[PDB]
Write an enzyme that holds these catalytic residues in place. Structure first.
Site, PDB file in Angstrom:
ATOM      1  N   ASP C 230      -1.780   1.811  10.273  1.00 51.37           N
ATOM      2  CA  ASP C 230      -1.414   1.088  11.501  1.00 51.37           C
ATOM      3  C   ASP C 230      -0.334   2.001  12.476  1.00 51.37           C
ATOM      4  O   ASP C 230       0.174   1.403  13.636  1.00 51.37           O
ATOM      5  CB  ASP C 230      -0.964  -0.186  11.181  1.00 51.37           C
ATOM      6  CG  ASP C 230       0.259  -0.244  10.538  1.00 51.37           C
ATOM      7  OD1 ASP C 230       1.190   0.567  10.655  1.00 51.37           O
ATOM      8  OD2 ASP C 230       0.662  -1.444   9.840  1.00 51.37           O
ATOM      9  N   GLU C 273      -2.896   1.167   3.871  1.00 52.20           N
ATOM     10  CA  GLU C 273      -3.401  -0.150   4.738  1.00 52.20           C
ATOM     11  C   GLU C 273      -4.748   0.200   5.496  1.00 52.20           C
ATOM     12  O   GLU C 273      -5.047  -0.684   6.567  1.00 52.20           O
ATOM     13  CB  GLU C 273      -2.414  -0.128   5.774  1.00 52.20           C
ATOM     14  CG  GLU C 273      -1.127  -0.558   5.226  1.00 52.20           C
ATOM     15  CD  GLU C 273      -0.979  -1.805   4.396  1.00 52.20           C
ATOM     16  OE1 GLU C 273      -1.927  -2.686   4.846  1.00 52.20           O
ATOM     17  OE2 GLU C 273       0.123  -2.316   3.872  1.00 52.20           O
TER      18      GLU C 273
HETATM   19 NI    NI Z   1       3.765   0.347   6.502  1.00 50.04          NI
HETATM   20 NI    NI Z   2       2.712  -0.499   9.339  1.00 48.24          NI
END
Ligand code: NI
Ligand code: NI
Ligand code: NI
Ligand code: NI
Ligand code: NI
Ligand code: NI
Lengths: 313, 313, 313
Positions: C230, C273
């Protein structure tokens, strides 16, 4: 005044995907000529070159459509040399990039001292012996470099060719998909280039400063800009055969050209690889053509800060 | 503490497309006031100005809705001057940019020494005599510059006007669609500006360094930021009447404002041209409003690196 | 030669959204191993760590799944320390970022002098006492910093932990969503960071120059890059649990890693992620995975300017 010579080159046999030969069409109907005149430009349309249909053109080793490619380029070189003798900047609205061979060749005939700026995601410097695809739109530069003659075999259709530029008269901008052999040639011949890594590092501003200083340091000389549409990011020019993510920005595209225009030395321009048949949507086609049109106008004066005539508004 | 004065200005007759008068609405329901308070801000909402309906307002030459435009601006100038005397930064949530005339005017009344930063894809400096559209949202600056008084005719509805700023107290940022007459005025009056070409060349960092040094070099003075939503790229603020590709980045938008905030001199803010009715999708509207909201919060302290109170976490 | 040790870590209890534990799967089937070998890389796959199912793992105060998180990290630390003793760069294909605790811990065991580059939109430095969500994927750094031990309570599952790095051995890049307490910790411990504001101001080029000089100035030392997907803009990596607009560019992502690769000091890599279940379309998933794959290859040599072997092409 910026005097231009429009050369339509509807050719596609330098690569597998058809449709790039529609390029001149979609660009003209996009209003390119009218828009150029809308500026302070003198424009003469030399028409779309009628390209010979070579039925018997079997591969040469791995090289595809060698006679068709070499003939179309030989035909273009003649016309380009024609408009140049007419004191006009040649604007080749093309199909595939293999046409660069004829375009740059005809240019150098009238201006042997020309310097080349090659905007592209690729180096298009594969030789018939290093190419793995055989598509000639990824080999144009190999045929033009003097240092390389001795490594380029005798390919049917290119006997008319004579390397016109040396490794020290060309600068690449936008590179992000280069083959190993091409990379070896880059470092071996000491060719100046600014891959996306250099653009990210220095900024397009410094990149342009360095490119022009590189080519025009010793002296002022005619400039030939070969603009491959895939040099820009696919989010801008999606309708093209060989797209590669992480490309040049719309803004960077305009910056490059606005800067070239400002030198006053542009003499040759190629707007290649626009293929309307490769857009996933009608808007993707419109987006590609519009961007290609905008980059063209920037080469001939259109400035984002504005423009005005020598009159009291 | 950052004390703000919210002025809702639901006005649209400065341009043809209706819906921009919904701006205050969509921004407020987006939670703007609540979000500003969520920070260390003192906020007083002066409400949405009730704008006079001027039925008999036929064109003046080519200028459209002159009495409606001039009246709404005269009304805003009064309120702005009001909040300024209340020691609060005026935040004009607008409709079209023609409101800049009233906004900047009322500001200068209380702070005649103000400097202006104009973020926009356009210069909005056309005169009634140079405008080709007649839309007043592209002429606000012409009414405010002292050097230009003598060229701006007597347009019904603007007799109350008095140029409050000179060519040396304004800086443009984001330019990419400037008319020839506007360009002539730029170079003629020596107005400082950073078109997209300068942003590409120098970087938004240097651009901001130079803009603030330019306006605050001689001395510190109140700053009025007039932010036209179309100054940012349409990929960020699509729901706006006059979009132009190749605009300011979301990040650059935040950089500009974060830098302005850090001067501690912001005294006037205009967030103009957000038209929810022009989004092609509900998300395009949401994307425009959210971006406009984010730029607003940045003007008043929100920093991407984070924020924290003078307490031991 | 770049010797790599692939560690699959299908874990998700560091955050609420399931699916991130599929990360190793989608990345491997994306051809990651094959692509790494396609380069001049020596690659050994240590497999996907079989993560203990801890049924009785009720919250600790507000902290969610503490025993599951602490156990999975303790398990990873052991494997990482294993590959490092095998003289190979550990590549942890993860689920959520809480795994950074085990990854960086096991790394430091073999290389206590390691420096960390943390690419992320967040600082992930919340403590059990400052976190407002309780999700451990936003607290990994708090458990690793020596300066912070005394503020991190005894959380079930992390008794094995021992802060291995000090505030002066980590640099953040990409920050744009930092909590107040995290910000207070940043300024209080004097942690070096480059939020999006610094990237916009200086350029990713200078940002990298400064980061490496910062960490490698005193001496050369192993580098651990913890890459949270992200950290890049959602237009590039949309399939991730905590996206934030205005992120790092695709190009900037490659620049960061190409630069790290060139130091020759990379010893630990986390690609975290990536959640294929969070893509709004199949292409959004493909776009995320492909980008994550490209950033991985750049860490191990793939250069945009091209690559070639020590042979005569
Ligand atoms: Ni992170
Ligand atoms: Ni992050
Ligand atoms: Ni190309
Ligand atoms: Ni090409
Ligand atoms: Ni505008
Ligand atoms: Ni405007």
């Amino acid at each position: 005044s910026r005097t231009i010579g429009i050369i339509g080159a509807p050719f596609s046999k330098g690569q597998p995907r058809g449709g790039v030969e529609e390029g001149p069409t979609v660009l003209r109907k996009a209003g390119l000529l009218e828009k150029l005149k809308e500026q302070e430009c003198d424009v003469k349309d030399y028409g779309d070159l009628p390209f010979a249909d070579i039925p018997n053109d079997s591969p040469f080793q791995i090289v595809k459509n060698p006679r068709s490619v070499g003939k179309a380029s030989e035909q273009l070189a003649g016309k380009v040399a024609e408009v140049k003798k007419n004191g006009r900047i040649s604007l080749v609205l093309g199909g595939d990039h293999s046409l660069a061979i004829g375009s740059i060749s005809g240019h150098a005939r009238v201006h042997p001292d020309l310097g080349v700026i090659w905007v592209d995601a690729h180096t298009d410097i594969n030789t018939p012996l290093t190419t793995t695809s055989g598509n000639l739109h990824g080999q144009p530069v190999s045929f033009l470099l003097k240092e390389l003659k001795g490594k380029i075999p005798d390919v049917p259709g290119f006997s008319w060719v004579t390397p016109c530029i040396s490794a020290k008269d060309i600068v690449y901008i936008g590179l992000r998909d280069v083959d190993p052999g091409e990379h070896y040639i880059l470092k071996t011949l000491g060719i100046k280039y600014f891959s996306m890594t250099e653009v990210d590092r220095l900024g397009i501003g410094k990149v342009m400063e360095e490119t022009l200083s590189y080519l025009l340091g010793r002296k002022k000389r005619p400039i030939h800009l070969s603009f491959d549409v895939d040099g820009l990011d696919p989010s801008f020019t999606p309708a093209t055969g060989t797209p590669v993510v992480g490309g040049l920005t719309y803004r960077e595209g305009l910056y490059i050209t606005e800067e070239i225009y400002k030198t006053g030395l542009l003499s040759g321009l190629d707007i290649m690889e626009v293929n309307p048949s490769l857009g996933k949507t009608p808007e993707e086609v419109t987006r590609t053509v519009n961007t290609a049109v905008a980059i063209t106008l920037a080469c001939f004066g259109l400035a984002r800060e504005g423009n005005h005539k020598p009159i009291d508004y």
